[PDB]
Design a protein around this ligand. Structure first.
Ligand SMILES: Nc1ncnc2c1ncn2[C@@H]1O[C@H](COP(=O)(O)OP(=O)(O)O)[C@@H](O)[C@H]1O
Ligand SMILES: Nc1ncnc2c1ncn2[C@@H]1O[C@H](COP(=O)(O)OP(=O)(O)O)[C@@H](O)[C@H]1O
Ligand SMILES: [Mg+2]
Ligand SMILES: [Mg+2]
Ligand SMILES: [Mg+2]
Lengths: 350, 346
């Protein structure tokens, strides 16, 4: 006798058919376990498409987790991240060729194209183009830092509230969404963890990595430190309070703040130099100011200096050496840095 | 009192200076731990350049190990891999911009550009363009499989002899070098281990490590099993014999052979299907042929069937479930599959 075989099963999102997706050749970035392409959906919708790298161990599992977290965020934290449009799974015979503009065999994720420029690209062109893209009236380092950080910290607080730690916060993963007033949206949940049993934790484990070493604290490349009881439904809440994995994002947000606030820190080399001196003085912002800032004559810390050094203090809060001392993104939101000035806008007010 | 500054120490290769190198925009790799670009050295030498990804944990350390292994291979197994032209290290102030043709900050490795096409790209275009690139006179599946596997196994044997296990053998990491008769050369020693103390082992440790899930044996993603002692200069030889880490490459070479020999196995899904069935029948090639091959009506296994199933037998040896049963690349090289034709009547 012979084995009967049977049909293939393919994952799909209602209203999203592969025939309606044209993929544009040319990856949008090196990528972690996946590759991102521009596409056009139904002839006139600009989208971004991601599949797994064939050469990376368990990339399909990582893409599945990214998919799961994206569904979670879509349901619980709308507007924090790029709009998630679902998945499309293609088989072998129906799989196409990127050069022919068709989706290849395997699982794909799709999002709205939120804009052609990241905060990293904009900030490096200058504060002016960054402010314009952000629709930020105060086109100064202080102005863009206030507006961007309010948006970023607000979104991170909302993500943390539904149990999601992004784990890859940085200017490169922020887009000023021109179709939503220039508001910042996060992209790339490929490293994100769901840290509460809602209903099951995802991508949540003890140990280092993944982490962008530019934006993760050098001796804190983990969400959970190794050894600690692996995350289960039982201990999830306890681990959250004890190990504070969300504070991983706090540190990264502090890095975002430094780069927004200080032009000279917008290069990898600039931020690296600062963080090295910061560490050297015991992660003490005032000690940096007292001992080191004098060696930064090519830079301008005015945005951090302003209003009694409010920005410096917010940086200190977000970038405390110890997680037990480090501000949550939610707490960081109520900081004086975000206060309206006395009588602000008085000259035009009704 | 203020702490004094001092010089920055940079690594350099004699004969290779920053002003000698122009980088061309457009990355070539899948971009895991490093980024690869084409470049031009001294105005008219085509080269390839690799730097560490700034956004990946331990990227520079991974590149440093790839550098060390490249020097070892350059010294001990010339011709097995792309020609290694050394390194160039640059500082931040002293770094440029890729889109402006200049090397950016950090360590860079440089190799000769060995050719524009990998075996993965060629085989997927077809046996004909693959054979042409290989200067392979017998432009059939059997012909390209014989020539390619002789070259690949010969090179792996030479690497193994000097203690190197490549650990990323696959068609995407083979280039047909037109300038050298079309011979296949390995690229990408980024996952490689030095398994002998010369003077120390490199990237060699117990347990799972880097692997391409298509080309590494799924239940065998290690060079040394998880229970193995850490390698030392004193036990390295014992561990080599006991755990046969080179047999990791043997399995991958078997996968290469399957794709060269059978057109339908050249897609990822094709080879994945075969390996699933192969595992299901106990890693037994004859059981595959008897129980499973009838399900593969769209494929042609003639190259493996030929000459008493010589190809199938060589695959079986390269792909035994147990390392202790699996052929070394050196032993495989002497297989009947590579025998000269008798009585050719010239
Ligand atoms: N929803 C989106 N809208 C617009 N651009 C996007 C979106 N998602 C991702 N991108 C762009 O795709 C690129 C993907 O790069 P990525 O996969 O992050 O690799 P890397 O981290 O090496 O840059 C990024 O430059 C990003 O700006
Ligand atoms: N010496 C070389 N000559 C020609 N092309 C090369 C050479 N080395 C690498 N390449 C090309 O660059 C790509 C990436 O190089 P590789 O070392 O395989 O890094 P990775 O696979 O990690 O991206 C290869 O797939 C190949 O196309
Ligand atoms: Mg990314
Ligand atoms: Mg695949
Ligand atoms: Mg490679």
């Amino acid at each position: 006798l012979k084995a009967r075989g049977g049909p293939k099963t393919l994952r799909r999102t209602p209203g999203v058919e592969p025939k309606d997706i044209r993929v544009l050749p040319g990856p949008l970035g090196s990528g972690n376990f996946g590759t991102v392409f521009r596409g056009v959906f139904k002839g006139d919708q600009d989208v971004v498409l991601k599949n797994a790298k064939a050469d990376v161990m368990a990339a399909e599992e990582l893409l599945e987790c990214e998919m799961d977290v994206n569904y979670h965020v879509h349901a619980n934290a709308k507007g924090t991240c790029a709009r998630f449009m679902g998945c499309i799974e293609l088989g072998a015979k129906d799989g196409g060729e990127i050069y022919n503009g068709t989706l290849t065999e395997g699982l794909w994720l799709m999002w709205a194209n939120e804009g052609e420029n990241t905060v990293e690209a904009l900030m490096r062109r200058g504060t002016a183009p960054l402010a314009t893209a952000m629709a930020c009236a105060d086109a100064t380092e202080l102005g863009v830092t206030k507006k961007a950080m309010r948006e970023l910290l607000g979104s991170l607080a909302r993500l943390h509230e539904c149990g999601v730690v992004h784990r890859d916060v940085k200017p490169a993963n922020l887009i000023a969404a021109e179709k939503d007033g220039g508001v910042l949206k996060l992209i790339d949940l490929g490293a994100a963890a769901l840290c509460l049993p809602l209903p099951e934790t995802l991508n949540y484990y003890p140990g280092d990595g993944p982490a962008d070493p530019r934006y993760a604290k050098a001796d804190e490349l983990y969400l959970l430190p190794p050894g600690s009881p692996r995350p289960t439904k039982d201990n999830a809440a306890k681990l959250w309070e004890a190990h504070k994995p969300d504070r991983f994002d706090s540190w990264s947000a502090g890095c975002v703040m430094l780069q927004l606030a200080v032009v000279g820190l917008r290069t990898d080399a600039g931020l690296e130099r600062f963080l090295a001196d910061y560490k050297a003085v015991g992660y003490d912002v005032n000690a940096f100011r007292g001992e080191k800032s004098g060696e930064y004559g090519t830079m301008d810390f005015a945005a951090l200096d302003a209003n009694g050094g409010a920005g410096w203090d917010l940086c200190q809060r977000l970038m405390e050496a110890e997680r037990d001392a480090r501000a949550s993104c939610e707490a960081a939101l109520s900081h004086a840095f975000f206060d309206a000035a006395a009588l602000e806008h008085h000259h035009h007010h009704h």
